[PDB]
Tab-separated table of C-alpha atoms and ligand atoms in Angstrom:
chain	number	residue	atom	x	y	z
A	3	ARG	CA	-0.039	-0.282	0.305
A	4	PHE	CA	3.145	2.259	-0.681
A	5	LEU	CA	4.275	0.668	-3.528
A	6	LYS	CA	7.364	0.835	-5.625
A	7	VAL	CA	8.371	1.535	-9.353
A	8	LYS	CA	11.778	0.716	-11.034
A	9	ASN	CA	13.509	2.024	-13.576
A	10	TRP	CA	15.536	-0.730	-15.165
A	11	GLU	CA	17.844	1.219	-17.235
A	12	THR	CA	19.259	3.300	-13.962
A	13	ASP	CA	18.336	1.093	-10.879
A	14	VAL	CA	16.301	3.714	-9.532
A	15	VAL	CA	13.376	3.147	-7.374
A	16	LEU	CA	10.972	5.343	-6.491
A	17	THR	CA	8.147	4.853	-3.789
A	18	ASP	CA	4.501	5.633	-4.539
A	19	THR	CA	2.127	6.680	-1.669
A	20	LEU	CA	0.190	9.391	-4.000
A	21	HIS	CA	-2.064	6.882	-5.164
A	22	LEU	CA	-3.694	6.315	-1.862
A	23	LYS	CA	-5.500	9.670	-3.031
A	24	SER	CA	-7.012	8.228	-6.145
A	25	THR	CA	-10.674	8.236	-6.319
A	26	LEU	CA	-11.671	7.138	-9.732
A	27	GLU	CA	-11.273	3.619	-11.166
A	28	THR	CA	-8.949	2.592	-13.937
A	29	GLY	CA	-10.837	-0.322	-15.293
A	30	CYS	CA	-8.471	-3.099	-14.358
A	31	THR	CA	-9.367	-5.563	-11.634
A	32	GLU	CA	-7.617	-8.258	-9.553
A	33	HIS	CA	-7.585	-10.649	-12.341
A	34	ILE	CA	-7.739	-8.516	-15.702
A	35	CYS	CA	-5.421	-5.833	-16.956
A	36	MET	CA	-6.823	-3.036	-19.194
A	37	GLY	CA	-3.837	-0.874	-19.281
A	38	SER	CA	-3.911	-1.104	-23.190
A	39	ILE	CA	-7.760	-0.251	-24.021
A	40	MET	CA	-8.126	3.014	-25.326
A	41	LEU	CA	-10.977	4.419	-23.965
A	42	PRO	CA	-11.578	2.496	-21.058
A	43	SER	CA	-15.310	2.866	-19.800
A	44	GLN	CA	-13.749	4.646	-16.804
A	45	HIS	CA	-11.803	7.071	-18.760
A	46	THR	CA	-15.193	8.854	-20.309
A	47	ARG	CA	-17.695	11.345	-19.071
A	52	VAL	CA	-26.022	14.004	-15.258
A	53	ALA	CA	-24.632	14.579	-11.646
A	54	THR	CA	-26.748	15.068	-8.018
A	55	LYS	CA	-26.550	17.503	-5.738
A	56	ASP	CA	-25.479	14.954	-3.239
A	57	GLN	CA	-22.745	13.804	-5.051
A	58	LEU	CA	-21.214	17.396	-5.327
A	59	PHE	CA	-20.282	18.622	-1.912
A	60	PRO	CA	-18.160	15.552	-1.276
A	61	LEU	CA	-16.492	16.341	-4.382
A	62	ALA	CA	-16.193	20.212	-3.887
A	63	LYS	CA	-15.018	19.510	-0.093
A	64	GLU	CA	-12.172	16.980	-1.527
A	65	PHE	CA	-11.288	19.335	-3.987
A	66	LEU	CA	-11.215	22.593	-1.762
A	67	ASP	CA	-9.321	20.805	1.002
A	68	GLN	CA	-6.380	20.038	-1.399
A	69	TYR	CA	-6.571	23.390	-2.860
A	70	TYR	CA	-6.349	25.173	0.428
A	71	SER	CA	-3.669	22.606	1.112
A	72	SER	CA	-1.816	23.735	-1.654
A	73	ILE	CA	-1.656	27.507	-0.501
A	74	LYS	CA	-0.650	26.561	2.853
A	75	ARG	CA	-3.357	27.476	4.683
A	76	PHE	CA	-5.184	23.901	4.978
A	77	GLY	CA	-7.948	23.885	7.741
A	78	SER	CA	-8.013	27.476	8.309
A	79	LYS	CA	-10.668	29.835	8.604
A	80	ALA	CA	-10.651	31.164	5.061
A	81	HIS	CA	-10.803	27.349	4.155
A	82	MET	CA	-13.747	26.516	6.376
A	83	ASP	CA	-15.839	29.364	5.031
A	84	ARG	CA	-15.353	28.683	1.553
A	85	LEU	CA	-16.550	24.937	2.620
A	86	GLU	CA	-19.548	26.633	4.074
A	87	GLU	CA	-20.171	29.106	1.202
A	88	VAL	CA	-19.906	26.302	-1.181
A	89	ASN	CA	-22.143	24.048	0.978
A	90	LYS	CA	-24.417	26.999	1.081
A	91	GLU	CA	-24.443	27.503	-2.820
A	92	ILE	CA	-25.015	24.019	-3.598
A	93	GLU	CA	-28.032	24.205	-1.081
A	94	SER	CA	-29.186	27.271	-3.242
A	95	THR	CA	-28.728	26.521	-6.558
A	96	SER	CA	-27.744	22.571	-6.523
A	97	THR	CA	-24.386	23.482	-8.119
A	98	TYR	CA	-21.578	26.152	-7.542
A	99	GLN	CA	-18.666	28.557	-9.264
A	100	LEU	CA	-14.977	28.337	-8.791
A	101	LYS	CA	-13.027	31.287	-7.769
A	102	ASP	CA	-10.536	32.486	-10.351
A	103	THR	CA	-8.300	31.311	-8.193
A	104	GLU	CA	-9.576	27.900	-7.881
A	105	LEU	CA	-9.997	27.681	-11.218
A	106	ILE	CA	-6.653	27.977	-12.292
A	107	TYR	CA	-5.267	25.607	-9.751
A	108	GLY	CA	-8.027	22.887	-10.588
A	109	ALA	CA	-6.743	23.457	-14.347
A	110	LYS	CA	-3.161	23.258	-13.695
A	111	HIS	CA	-3.804	19.821	-11.681
A	112	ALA	CA	-5.976	18.265	-14.157
A	113	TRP	CA	-3.119	18.712	-16.663
A	114	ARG	CA	-0.542	17.623	-14.071
A	115	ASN	CA	-2.878	14.393	-13.257
A	116	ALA	CA	-2.957	13.775	-16.794
A	117	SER	CA	-1.163	10.139	-16.718
A	118	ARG	CA	-1.011	9.897	-20.630
A	119	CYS	CA	0.535	13.127	-21.047
A	120	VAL	CA	4.841	12.868	-21.475
A	121	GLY	CA	5.141	16.788	-21.597
A	122	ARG	CA	3.633	17.244	-17.535
A	123	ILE	CA	7.255	18.776	-16.631
A	124	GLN	CA	5.437	22.126	-17.347
A	125	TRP	CA	2.086	21.488	-15.813
A	126	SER	CA	2.253	24.778	-13.563
A	127	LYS	CA	3.180	26.764	-16.818
A	128	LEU	CA	-0.319	27.478	-17.822
A	129	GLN	CA	-1.973	30.054	-18.738
A	130	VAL	CA	-5.740	30.102	-18.178
A	131	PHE	CA	-8.209	31.800	-19.761
A	132	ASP	CA	-11.582	32.325	-18.331
A	133	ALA	CA	-14.020	31.836	-20.752
A	134	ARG	CA	-16.882	31.462	-18.212
A	135	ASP	CA	-19.058	34.406	-19.171
A	136	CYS	CA	-19.308	33.413	-22.600
A	137	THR	CA	-23.004	32.897	-24.182
A	138	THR	CA	-22.822	32.660	-27.933
A	139	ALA	CA	-20.732	30.500	-30.731
A	140	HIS	CA	-19.477	34.366	-31.982
A	141	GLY	CA	-18.245	34.748	-28.265
A	142	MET	CA	-16.402	31.217	-28.248
A	143	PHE	CA	-14.754	31.952	-31.606
A	144	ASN	CA	-13.306	35.267	-30.154
A	145	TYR	CA	-12.177	33.323	-27.194
A	146	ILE	CA	-11.109	30.518	-29.329
A	147	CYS	CA	-9.077	32.851	-31.433
A	148	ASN	CA	-7.447	34.899	-28.686
A	149	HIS	CA	-6.256	31.499	-27.259
A	150	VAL	CA	-4.663	30.429	-30.888
A	151	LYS	CA	-3.060	33.929	-31.236
A	152	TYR	CA	-1.823	33.519	-27.574
A	153	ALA	CA	-0.848	30.226	-27.421
A	154	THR	CA	0.875	30.482	-30.867
A	155	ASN	CA	2.981	33.521	-29.759
A	156	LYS	CA	4.493	33.780	-33.098
A	157	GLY	CA	5.893	30.101	-32.866
A	158	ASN	CA	7.714	30.505	-29.413
A	159	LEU	CA	4.546	28.443	-28.268
A	160	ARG	CA	2.985	28.568	-24.957
A	161	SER	CA	0.519	26.643	-22.863
A	162	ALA	CA	-2.784	27.495	-22.579
A	163	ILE	CA	-6.906	26.438	-22.011
A	164	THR	CA	-9.693	28.442	-22.299
A	165	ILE	CA	-12.691	27.175	-20.065
A	166	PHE	CA	-16.242	27.621	-21.179
A	167	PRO	CA	-18.901	27.504	-19.088
A	168	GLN	CA	-19.611	24.440	-16.675
A	169	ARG	CA	-22.575	22.059	-17.577
A	170	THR	CA	-25.388	22.951	-15.790
A	171	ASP	CA	-28.613	20.766	-16.589
A	172	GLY	CA	-26.473	18.765	-19.216
A	173	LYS	CA	-29.046	20.011	-21.920
A	174	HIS	CA	-27.006	23.383	-22.550
A	175	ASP	CA	-23.658	22.489	-23.051
A	176	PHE	CA	-20.841	24.223	-24.625
A	177	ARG	CA	-18.901	22.322	-26.733
A	178	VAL	CA	-16.142	22.772	-29.581
A	179	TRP	CA	-17.219	19.763	-31.986
A	180	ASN	CA	-13.397	19.736	-33.647
A	181	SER	CA	-11.324	17.239	-31.538
A	182	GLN	CA	-8.213	19.545	-32.050
A	183	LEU	CA	-8.803	23.525	-33.033
A	184	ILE	CA	-6.238	23.256	-35.606
A	185	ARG	CA	-7.005	20.069	-38.234
A	186	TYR	CA	-6.882	19.342	-41.687
A	187	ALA	CA	-9.831	17.922	-43.682
A	188	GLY	CA	-10.572	14.504	-44.315
A	189	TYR	CA	-11.783	13.912	-48.045
A	190	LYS	CA	-12.937	10.668	-49.228
A	191	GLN	CA	-12.476	10.791	-52.976
A	192	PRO	CA	-14.809	9.180	-55.973
A	193	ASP	CA	-12.549	6.147	-56.127
A	194	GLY	CA	-12.747	5.394	-52.420
A	195	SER	CA	-9.680	6.583	-51.392
A	196	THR	CA	-8.878	9.549	-48.890
A	197	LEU	CA	-7.359	13.019	-49.556
A	198	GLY	CA	-6.022	15.053	-46.163
A	199	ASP	CA	-6.552	13.299	-43.217
A	200	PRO	CA	-8.423	10.175	-42.886
A	201	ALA	CA	-9.207	10.793	-39.337
A	202	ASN	CA	-11.412	13.706	-40.014
A	203	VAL	CA	-13.408	12.329	-43.090
A	204	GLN	CA	-16.568	12.263	-41.132
A	205	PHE	CA	-15.991	15.773	-39.112
A	206	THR	CA	-15.261	17.203	-42.762
A	207	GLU	CA	-18.224	16.436	-44.135
A	208	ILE	CA	-20.722	17.268	-40.755
A	209	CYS	CA	-19.263	20.822	-41.430
A	210	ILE	CA	-20.073	20.691	-45.165
A	211	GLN	CA	-23.727	19.677	-43.843
A	212	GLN	CA	-23.798	22.815	-41.824
A	213	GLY	CA	-22.595	24.664	-44.820
A	214	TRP	CA	-18.983	24.242	-45.216
A	215	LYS	CA	-17.354	25.275	-48.451
A	216	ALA	CA	-14.354	22.751	-48.906
A	217	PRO	CA	-11.084	23.547	-50.646
A	218	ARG	CA	-10.932	19.886	-51.518
A	219	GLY	CA	-7.129	19.325	-50.961
A	220	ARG	CA	-4.896	18.304	-48.564
A	221	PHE	CA	-3.732	20.678	-45.729
A	222	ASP	CA	-6.991	22.615	-45.649
A	223	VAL	CA	-7.490	23.948	-42.235
A	224	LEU	CA	-11.335	23.057	-40.890
A	225	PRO	CA	-13.398	25.531	-39.711
A	226	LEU	CA	-14.811	25.399	-35.972
A	227	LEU	CA	-17.914	23.935	-35.100
A	228	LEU	CA	-19.055	25.789	-31.769
A	229	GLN	CA	-21.907	24.862	-29.956
A	230	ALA	CA	-23.133	27.646	-27.372
A	231	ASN	CA	-25.264	26.815	-24.285
A	232	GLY	CA	-26.761	23.668	-25.921
A	233	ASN	CA	-27.710	25.525	-29.370
A	234	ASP	CA	-26.835	23.904	-32.750
A	235	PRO	CA	-23.152	24.490	-33.464
A	236	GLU	CA	-21.919	27.261	-35.927
A	237	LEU	CA	-19.213	27.726	-38.394
A	238	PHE	CA	-16.120	29.798	-38.131
A	239	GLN	CA	-13.181	30.363	-40.104
A	240	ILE	CA	-10.223	30.641	-37.901
A	241	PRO	CA	-8.186	33.776	-39.284
A	242	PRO	CA	-5.329	32.230	-41.424
A	243	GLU	CA	-3.036	34.555	-40.256
A	244	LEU	CA	-3.379	32.989	-36.972
A	245	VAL	CA	-2.807	29.620	-38.245
A	246	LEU	CA	0.968	28.790	-38.135
A	247	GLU	CA	1.630	26.177	-40.190
A	248	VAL	CA	5.525	24.687	-41.144
A	249	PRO	CA	6.765	23.536	-44.265
A	250	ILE	CA	8.273	19.942	-43.958
A	251	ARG	CA	12.135	19.942	-45.461
A	252	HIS	CA	14.574	17.274	-44.573
A	253	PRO	CA	18.076	18.662	-43.685
A	254	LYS	CA	19.418	16.145	-46.665
A	255	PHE	CA	17.100	14.921	-49.022
A	256	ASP	CA	16.099	18.149	-51.281
A	257	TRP	CA	13.537	16.130	-52.726
A	258	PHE	CA	11.801	16.347	-49.718
A	259	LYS	CA	10.285	19.478	-50.327
A	260	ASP	CA	8.298	18.296	-53.197
A	261	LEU	CA	6.805	15.968	-51.086
A	262	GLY	CA	4.807	18.858	-50.030
A	263	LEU	CA	4.315	18.128	-46.173
A	264	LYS	CA	3.094	20.622	-43.626
A	265	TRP	CA	1.514	20.911	-40.357
A	266	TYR	CA	0.433	23.222	-37.726
A	267	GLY	CA	2.549	24.444	-34.882
A	268	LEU	CA	-0.160	24.127	-32.037
A	269	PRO	CA	-1.673	21.127	-30.748
A	270	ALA	CA	-4.914	22.064	-29.085
A	271	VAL	CA	-7.155	19.404	-28.097
A	272	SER	CA	-10.824	20.536	-27.730
A	273	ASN	CA	-13.200	17.381	-27.201
A	274	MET	CA	-11.888	16.755	-23.797
A	275	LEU	CA	-13.744	17.399	-20.737
A	276	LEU	CA	-12.157	19.141	-17.793
A	277	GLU	CA	-13.493	18.050	-13.777
A	278	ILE	CA	-12.919	20.296	-11.303
A	279	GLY	CA	-14.468	19.623	-7.421
A	280	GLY	CA	-17.099	17.830	-9.705
A	281	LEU	CA	-17.947	20.730	-11.987
A	282	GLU	CA	-17.982	19.448	-15.568
A	283	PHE	CA	-16.593	21.824	-18.059
A	284	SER	CA	-17.382	20.219	-21.348
A	285	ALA	CA	-15.922	22.863	-23.406
A	286	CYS	CA	-11.898	23.347	-22.179
A	287	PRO	CA	-9.815	23.352	-25.532
A	288	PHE	CA	-6.190	23.081	-24.166
A	289	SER	CA	-3.028	23.560	-26.447
A	290	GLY	CA	1.152	23.185	-25.977
A	291	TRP	CA	3.409	22.329	-28.450
A	292	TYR	CA	4.287	19.330	-30.138
A	293	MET	CA	6.781	16.330	-29.758
A	294	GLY	CA	8.272	15.545	-33.190
A	295	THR	CA	6.688	12.028	-33.448
A	296	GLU	CA	3.146	12.793	-32.831
A	297	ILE	CA	3.245	14.502	-36.524
A	298	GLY	CA	6.084	12.232	-37.966
A	299	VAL	CA	4.694	8.820	-36.560
A	300	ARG	CA	1.528	9.167	-35.988
A	301	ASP	CA	-0.036	11.998	-38.322
A	302	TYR	CA	2.159	10.701	-41.065
A	303	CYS	CA	2.752	7.346	-40.841
A	304	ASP	CA	-0.648	5.699	-39.142
A	305	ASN	CA	-1.855	3.424	-41.884
A	306	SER	CA	-5.055	5.248	-41.354
A	307	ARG	CA	-3.742	8.866	-41.565
A	308	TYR	CA	-1.474	10.118	-44.379
A	309	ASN	CA	0.379	7.000	-44.611
A	310	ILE	CA	3.167	8.713	-46.322
A	311	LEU	CA	5.674	5.400	-45.791
A	312	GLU	CA	4.606	4.137	-49.256
A	313	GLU	CA	5.666	7.351	-51.060
A	314	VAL	CA	8.569	8.220	-48.732
A	315	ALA	CA	10.433	5.165	-49.017
A	316	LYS	CA	10.063	5.320	-52.846
A	317	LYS	CA	12.007	8.769	-53.202
A	318	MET	CA	14.830	7.187	-51.211
A	319	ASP	CA	14.843	3.866	-53.129
A	320	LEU	CA	14.580	1.785	-50.809
A	321	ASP	CA	14.479	-2.200	-50.994
A	322	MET	CA	10.597	-2.137	-50.935
A	323	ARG	CA	9.627	-5.844	-51.729
A	324	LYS	CA	10.995	-7.649	-48.448
A	325	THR	CA	9.464	-6.490	-44.770
A	326	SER	CA	12.637	-7.540	-43.198
A	327	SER	CA	14.845	-4.785	-45.216
A	328	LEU	CA	13.672	-2.525	-42.676
A	329	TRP	CA	12.479	0.237	-45.160
A	330	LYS	CA	9.596	1.446	-43.175
A	331	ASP	CA	11.511	2.005	-40.381
A	332	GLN	CA	14.633	3.503	-42.511
A	333	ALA	CA	12.046	5.754	-44.029
A	334	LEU	CA	10.326	6.818	-40.891
A	335	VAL	CA	13.651	8.089	-39.363
A	336	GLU	CA	13.910	10.504	-41.843
A	337	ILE	CA	10.508	11.679	-41.590
A	338	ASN	CA	11.001	12.842	-37.825
A	339	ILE	CA	14.508	14.482	-38.584
A	340	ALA	CA	12.902	16.297	-41.222
A	341	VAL	CA	9.749	17.236	-38.775
A	342	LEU	CA	12.003	18.476	-35.848
A	343	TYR	CA	14.264	20.001	-38.235
A	344	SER	CA	11.447	22.066	-40.221
A	345	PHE	CA	10.217	23.355	-36.826
A	346	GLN	CA	13.156	24.310	-35.141
A	347	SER	CA	14.757	26.406	-38.468
A	348	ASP	CA	11.513	27.897	-38.224
A	349	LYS	CA	11.518	28.983	-34.390
A	350	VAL	CA	8.606	27.107	-33.822
A	351	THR	CA	8.504	25.053	-30.403
A	352	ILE	CA	8.589	21.147	-30.744
A	353	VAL	CA	10.727	18.646	-28.850
A	354	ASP	CA	12.086	15.385	-29.921
A	355	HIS	CA	10.834	12.099	-28.437
A	356	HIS	CA	14.548	11.902	-26.535
A	357	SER	CA	14.378	15.207	-24.564
A	358	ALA	CA	10.847	14.858	-24.082
A	359	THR	CA	11.084	11.638	-22.352
A	360	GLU	CA	13.996	12.501	-20.355
A	361	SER	CA	12.091	15.589	-19.302
A	362	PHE	CA	9.560	13.095	-17.740
A	363	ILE	CA	11.736	10.881	-15.698
A	364	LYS	CA	12.870	14.409	-14.564
A	365	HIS	CA	8.996	15.229	-13.748
A	366	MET	CA	8.668	12.132	-12.317
A	367	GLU	CA	11.222	12.393	-9.869
A	368	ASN	CA	10.184	15.633	-8.770
A	369	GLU	CA	6.593	14.003	-8.345
A	370	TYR	CA	7.794	11.279	-6.258
A	371	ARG	CA	9.800	13.894	-4.190
A	372	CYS	CA	7.441	16.843	-3.386
A	373	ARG	CA	4.512	15.052	-4.001
A	374	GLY	CA	4.538	11.135	-3.333
A	375	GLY	CA	4.054	10.167	-6.569
A	376	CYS	CA	2.894	10.793	-10.481
A	377	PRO	CA	-0.011	8.711	-12.351
A	378	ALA	CA	1.539	7.500	-15.749
A	379	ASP	CA	0.195	5.413	-18.474
A	380	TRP	CA	3.200	3.645	-19.943
A	381	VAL	CA	1.249	2.334	-23.039
A	382	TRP	CA	0.561	6.088	-24.016
A	383	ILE	CA	3.808	7.777	-22.539
A	384	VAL	CA	6.303	5.382	-24.578
A	385	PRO	CA	6.958	7.319	-27.982
A	386	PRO	CA	5.735	5.647	-30.877
A	387	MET	CA	9.283	4.746	-32.029
A	388	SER	CA	12.487	3.992	-31.086
A	389	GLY	CA	10.911	3.219	-27.584
A	390	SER	CA	13.427	1.104	-25.622
A	391	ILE	CA	16.626	3.701	-26.310
A	392	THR	CA	14.259	6.763	-24.597
A	393	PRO	CA	14.300	6.638	-20.918
A	394	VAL	CA	10.679	6.276	-20.458
A	395	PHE	CA	10.855	2.483	-21.968
A	396	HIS	CA	12.597	1.518	-19.028
A	397	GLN	CA	10.570	3.244	-16.057
A	398	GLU	CA	8.226	1.262	-14.120
A	399	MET	CA	5.164	3.755	-14.331
A	400	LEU	CA	1.714	3.042	-11.804
A	401	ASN	CA	-1.357	4.466	-13.419
A	402	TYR	CA	-4.025	5.617	-11.164
A	403	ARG	CA	-7.145	8.369	-11.635
A	404	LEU	CA	-6.689	11.408	-9.433
A	405	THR	CA	-8.670	14.918	-9.873
A	406	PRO	CA	-8.953	17.428	-11.350
A	407	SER	CA	-9.015	15.461	-14.268
A	408	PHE	CA	-9.008	15.641	-18.151
A	409	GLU	CA	-11.913	13.060	-19.256
A	410	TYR	CA	-13.015	11.761	-22.754
A	411	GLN	CA	-16.521	12.604	-23.887
A	412	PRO	CA	-19.004	11.221	-26.604
A	413	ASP	CA	-18.503	13.122	-29.692
A	414	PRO	CA	-21.451	16.189	-29.713
A	415	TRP	CA	-23.196	14.529	-33.003
A	416	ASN	CA	-23.794	11.539	-31.632
A	417	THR	CA	-25.733	13.343	-28.082
A	418	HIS	CA	-27.151	16.201	-29.354
A	419	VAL	CA	-30.859	16.619	-29.231
A	420	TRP	CA	-30.945	18.514	-32.825
A	421	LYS	CA	-33.099	21.125	-34.447
B	1	HEM	C1	3.636	21.624	-23.241
B	1	HEM	C2	3.694	20.745	-24.000
B	1	HEM	C3	3.260	19.408	-24.064
B	1	HEM	C4	3.589	18.073	-24.537
B	1	HEM	C5	5.052	17.874	-25.645
B	1	HEM	C6	2.781	17.296	-24.637
B	1	HEM	C7	2.659	16.230	-24.993
B	1	HEM	C8	1.845	15.174	-25.098
B	1	HEM	C9	1.875	13.902	-25.848
B	1	HEM	C10	2.863	13.431	-26.843
B	1	HEM	C11	0.785	13.124	-25.917
B	1	HEM	C12	0.216	12.132	-26.577
B	1	HEM	C13	-1.172	12.573	-27.664
B	1	HEM	C14	-1.260	11.306	-28.485
B	1	HEM	O1	-0.587	10.469	-28.486
B	1	HEM	O2	-2.188	11.561	-28.971
B	1	HEM	C15	-0.693	13.940	-24.902
B	1	HEM	C16	-1.670	13.903	-24.347
B	1	HEM	C17	-2.511	14.608	-23.621
B	1	HEM	N1	-1.714	15.575	-23.206
B	1	HEM	FE1	0.061	16.761	-23.014
B	1	HEM	N2	1.451	17.782	-23.857
B	1	HEM	C18	1.762	19.414	-23.954
B	1	HEM	C19	0.707	20.157	-23.286
B	1	HEM	C20	-0.113	19.702	-22.634
B	1	HEM	C21	-1.171	20.745	-21.983
B	1	HEM	C22	-1.061	22.304	-21.665
B	1	HEM	C23	-2.393	20.363	-21.350
B	1	HEM	C24	-3.568	20.567	-20.778
B	1	HEM	C25	-3.512	21.630	-19.804
B	1	HEM	C26	-1.842	18.416	-21.762
B	1	HEM	C27	-2.854	17.637	-21.429
B	1	HEM	C28	-2.634	16.580	-22.114
B	1	HEM	C29	-4.021	15.107	-22.084
B	1	HEM	C30	-5.211	15.441	-21.145
B	1	HEM	C31	-3.519	14.162	-22.620
B	1	HEM	C32	-4.115	12.767	-22.759
B	1	HEM	C33	-5.182	12.867	-23.902
B	1	HEM	C34	-5.771	11.691	-23.879
B	1	HEM	O3	-6.138	10.988	-22.571
B	1	HEM	O4	-6.104	11.211	-24.869
B	1	HEM	N3	-0.758	18.491	-22.270
B	1	HEM	N4	0.585	15.573	-24.548
B	2	LIG	C1	-1.687	19.779	-25.537
B	2	LIG	C2	-1.218	18.845	-26.139
B	2	LIG	C3	0.063	18.771	-26.365
B	2	LIG	C4	0.645	17.767	-27.613
B	2	LIG	N1	1.884	17.605	-27.867
B	2	LIG	N2	-0.308	17.190	-28.333
B	2	LIG	C5	-1.438	16.850	-27.623
B	2	LIG	C6	-2.663	15.925	-28.335
B	2	LIG	C7	-3.553	15.160	-27.575
B	2	LIG	C8	-4.307	14.235	-28.069
B	2	LIG	C9	-4.789	13.453	-27.748
B	2	LIG	N3	-6.346	13.327	-28.152
B	2	LIG	C10	-7.317	12.852	-26.854
B	2	LIG	C11	-7.689	11.597	-27.956
B	2	LIG	F1	-7.635	10.681	-27.070
B	2	LIG	F2	-8.693	12.044	-28.657
B	2	LIG	C12	-6.377	12.006	-28.820
B	2	LIG	C13	-4.382	14.413	-29.517
B	2	LIG	C14	-3.451	15.305	-30.367
B	2	LIG	F3	-3.553	14.958	-31.901
B	2	LIG	C15	-2.667	16.231	-30.133
B	2	LIG	F4	-1.873	16.650	-30.412
B	2	LIG	C16	-2.098	18.035	-26.741
B	3	H4B	C1	-4.096	-0.270	-28.466
B	3	H4B	C2	-3.546	1.080	-28.048
B	3	H4B	O1	-4.224	1.014	-26.430
B	3	H4B	C3	-3.549	2.460	-28.578
B	3	H4B	O2	-3.234	2.192	-30.311
B	3	H4B	C4	-2.763	3.255	-28.313
B	3	H4B	C5	-1.282	2.747	-27.568
B	3	H4B	N1	-0.309	3.538	-27.284
B	3	H4B	C6	-0.729	5.065	-27.666
B	3	H4B	N2	-0.074	6.378	-27.173
B	3	H4B	C7	-0.112	7.357	-27.634
B	3	H4B	N3	0.768	8.250	-27.238
B	3	H4B	N4	-1.008	7.834	-28.422
B	3	H4B	C8	-1.626	6.810	-29.055
B	3	H4B	O3	-2.949	7.419	-29.679
B	3	H4B	C9	-1.639	5.566	-28.663
B	3	H4B	N5	-2.366	4.587	-28.886
B	4	ZN	ZN1	-3.834	-2.809	-15.342
């Protein structure tokens, strides 16, 4: 009940006691491990007034513990204040300070995130006064421009009004603020990003005018207060894109690949002291492999191993020539080199995983643990030559937290 994790590259052991403060469930049992189930039944998000105060008290207790005024008079009055408000309105409203804390610690607790070394450097944009889809558009544009910061990217989150009844939900329908369109072709194949083929069509059904190419930045589909969502084009001067060149292969430019600088998840739900924030887009900067391995090389994504290997003139007949592997290294050297040559913030999978081991050390020292999801923390290439491969990690669910949630078009009582 005071568990040990080992590193088998360094023989370093750390003792995890933080997992005792865990509340939520993982999906595993004593007899079955679900650690490679992608969206486990637990990781996805109406809630009543009785359940709300334990969640508020728990959250408030750790917040005041963090400002080193645990259980003071200022704490007990805020406990009374929120109890009374959950009497009156059967819900409550976070202080600005409580919101910034909750948000930072949702990131801090995000066990699948390898970049958490940065968890306290988070800009929080309180959008809880927003009322309209145009309001959201404005807030999201300010977010993009701030977080991008001319390529010196900055981490940020924008928190739209919390869920109330459940039928008046603020939702960004985009999975990520900036994504390329997916167009299936009349001959069955797919242009652009096959991940977004459904979403790309949803936008056209609401009226989008597609410039049917590859890297067409999708418009925003913003749903305010449960109302049918509305289309908005992010000013192109706000969407920073990196053309991908290699530092050796000049035919690499003719591949005509590019990516956006800003990774900005918009479809998750932020949970703070039992309050549910259905629209909470958050952004950092990219680890190279996200674009160069997954985005470019997943069979279900751009799938460029085929044509990259061609132009390298590779032994493509035999599986064991490792032509896929060789082509995949070049692709991620190019992604990295291109972002850096433009002063656009990006991190290589070696630097990021080393920082995470450093982050784990700090969490196990000044916090007693660090929830970590090995399946997700290990990079999708060169796994064992990064230090996280050899690092035992205890996964467990802490709160505040980012949670998955259904795609809004499966759940939105429409009109
Ligand atoms: C600062 C630079 C950051 C880097 C380099 C980074 C890195 C990553 C990577 C590589 C992933 C895996 C993504 C995937 O495989 O799809 C991830 C996931 C995630 N990131 Fe971070 N991240 C950063 C900032 C942030 C911020 C600012 C937040 C929120 C405030 C955040 C929250 C999350 C969450 C919740 C996930 C997991 C999503 C899921 O469970 O599917 N990250 N991050
Ligand atoms: C803040 C941040 C930094 C960074 N480097 N990456 C991401 C990032 C996260 C995800 C997770 N998504 C939720 C899902 F499970 F649906 C897949 C998907 C992406 F495409 C990303 F770019 C986010
Ligand atoms: C089956 C498995 O759970 C699924 O492919 C996961 C594996 N690990 C991952 N790790 C990260 N970082 N991102 C992912 O999308 C996935 N996908
Ligand atoms: Zn397990």
